[PDB]
Design a protein around this nucleic acid. Sequence first.
RNA 1: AUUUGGUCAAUUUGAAUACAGAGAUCAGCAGUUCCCCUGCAUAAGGAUGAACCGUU
Length: 50
Amino acid sequence: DMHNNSISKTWEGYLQDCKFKGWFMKVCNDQDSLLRTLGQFDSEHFYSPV
RNA sequence: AUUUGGUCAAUUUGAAUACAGAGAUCAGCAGUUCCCCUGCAUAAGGAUGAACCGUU
């Protein structure tokens, strides 16, 4: 039962160079790890911690 | 009171032969245009489905 769960569109933009080689879904144990993963495409800035 | 409205053409001629003059009728199908339905393609544009975790 997940009434708490929800989704929000954070961004809806245009990128100069698309460094994402494919669609590499993942899970990480921590936030730092996630950030690092994101920055594998030289783009940590996508994640919005709230 | 009379009379014109009355010349067959065609051919053989240097009047004779001709004798009215030479496809019909019934029925398909396709095309042309517009419309409607149906299946497919092409573009575009939606809508939606599908277990479960992925990739340095």
